[PDB]
Amino acid sequence: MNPIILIIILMTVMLGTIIVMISTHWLLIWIGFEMNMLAIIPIMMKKHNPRATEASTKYFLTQSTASMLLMMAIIINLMFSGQWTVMKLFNPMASMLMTMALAMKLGMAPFHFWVPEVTQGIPLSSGLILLTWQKLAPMSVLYQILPSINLDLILTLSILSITIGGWGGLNQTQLRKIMAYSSIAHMGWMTAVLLYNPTMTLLNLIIYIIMTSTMFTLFMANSTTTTLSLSHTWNKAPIMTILVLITLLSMGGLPPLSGFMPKWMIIQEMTKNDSIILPTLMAITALLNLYFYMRLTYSTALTMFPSTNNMKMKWQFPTTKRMTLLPTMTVLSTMLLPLTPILSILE
């Protein structure tokens, strides 16, 4: 791919997301979603492998069904309201259709089946672009329509996403599938608090974006795709293993790291509304996310798996990858707890 064409395609993705974010018309939301899908399709086809083609086909079919359901919801709201302003919807059927459309777009369970599939078949940079940038626009659309969101449906989707993400990440050996199931659990966390306080949804979105960016940047820097190469990383560079141990510690919500910051705040907005069973259940389920993070830290940094003879050659060459914002994202994702009230800038 040409650098100019790749740059133009990336700005097209950014323009589509911005168009969804800044528009006050439903047709422009739909237009931005199609812009985003059409411009992100070739990034998944960067290597021209059969797995990339199948992943792009599955992503295309799921996004097409989601966009068509979104247009059906827009048309129903047009009929029953006579206007296009992006605000609360004026039909429960249109609200339900739009909610399941955005759940299919975000990868919420039980529409999650493409997320561990697709992320396995695409490169690491494209998977990072997916799992971080593609989740901004549907979360904005969910933010704007929360007066019409059914509570039962969104809480069912949240608990299903958290449980299925934990039980799915409990099994994998590949890193990309682990990050996919972790993403599913995290969006269950973010949507569980949406109807009570969306500022916590914004805070959890930002923290999840920083953590996923740090982990994917570490994986790109070490060129690791399975757990065994991540185990091998201890011989080549120990500082990378220390960084992935600290980041995986923070991703599990272990205090005093910054990953304790979102979910705890979420509990603080759900015991105010006298809902005690749900946050306790969600923390108990997120213990499984902590479990497979602990398994990864056991394999990587807390022990030393055996290495090979050719690794000695890799001792003679310094790394030359542009590890952009890796120290900043490592610091920001782990020592951000003593600046917890800064979330008030998102209110």
Partner: protein
């Protein structure tokens, strides 16, 4: 945690590239006169 169902599952290749798993041939008959056997590539 392998079970009976996921017993034949192989690990993905390290480069994530699978093995890739023809020339068209035409026969123009005698329908002066000439029979041509042509091999094309598109």
């Amino acid at each position: 945690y392998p079970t009976k169902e996921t017993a034949h599952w192989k690990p993905p290749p390290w480069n994530d590239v699978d093995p890739p798993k023809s020339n068209l041939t035409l026969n123009f008959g005698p329908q002066g006169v000439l029979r041509l056997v042509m091999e094309l590539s598109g």
